[PDB]
Amino acid sequence: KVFGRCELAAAMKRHGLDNYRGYSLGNWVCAAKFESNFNTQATNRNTDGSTDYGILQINSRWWCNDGRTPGSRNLCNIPCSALLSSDITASVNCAKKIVSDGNGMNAWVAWRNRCKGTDVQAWIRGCRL
């Protein structure tokens, strides 16, 4: 499913991401925009043979099992395929673990390169929230 900006913001807010570990809603919507362009079915393969999945492009090397990343750790206890659903609950639950892991939102390269230190509040402006 391809989210609209305000629709995603509303879903993420509902799932408890606004200000989770001090990251305002705008940071999360910005992250999704640049990781996946708001597409839950987005997948990308990396050089190491791991794959990034869903709206927040969570990586199979640490976070989910996809059955083809030798030595993966499965920390979110989830098939990576669950990260592609139109329901973002699994993605959000996993993301909360990732962000609490010690590097914050820096675990998302597109956040660090394209959202970090920018006016993230622009990603929720105009939304009914």
UniProtKB/Swiss-Prot annotation:
Its EC number is 3.2.1.17. Disulfide bonds join C6-C127, C30-C115, C64-C80, C76-C94. Its main location: secreted. In the egg white and polymorphonuclear leukocytes. SUPFAM superfamilies: Lysozyme-like (SSF53955). It catalyses: Hydrolysis of (1->4)-beta-linkages between N-acetylmuramic acid and N-acetyl-D-glucosamine residues in a peptidoglycan and between N-acetyl-D-glucosamine residues in chitodextrins. The keyword DNA damage does not apply. Residues 1-129 form the C-type lysozyme domain. Pfam families: Lys. It is an enzyme of class 3 (hydrolase). Keywords: Allergen, Antimicrobial, Bacteriolytic enzyme, Disulfide bond, Glycosidase, Hydrolase, Secreted, Signal. Lysozyme C is capable of both hydrolysis and transglycosylation; it also shows a slight esterase activity. It acts rapidly on both peptide-substituted and unsubstituted peptidoglycan, and slowly on chitin oligosaccharides. Belongs to the glycosyl hydrolase 22 family. Lysozymes have primarily a bacteriolytic function; those in tissues and body fluids are associated with the monocyte-macrophage system and enhance the activity of immunoagents. Has bacteriolytic activity against M.luteus. This is Lysozyme C. It comes from Gallus gallus. The gene is LYZ.
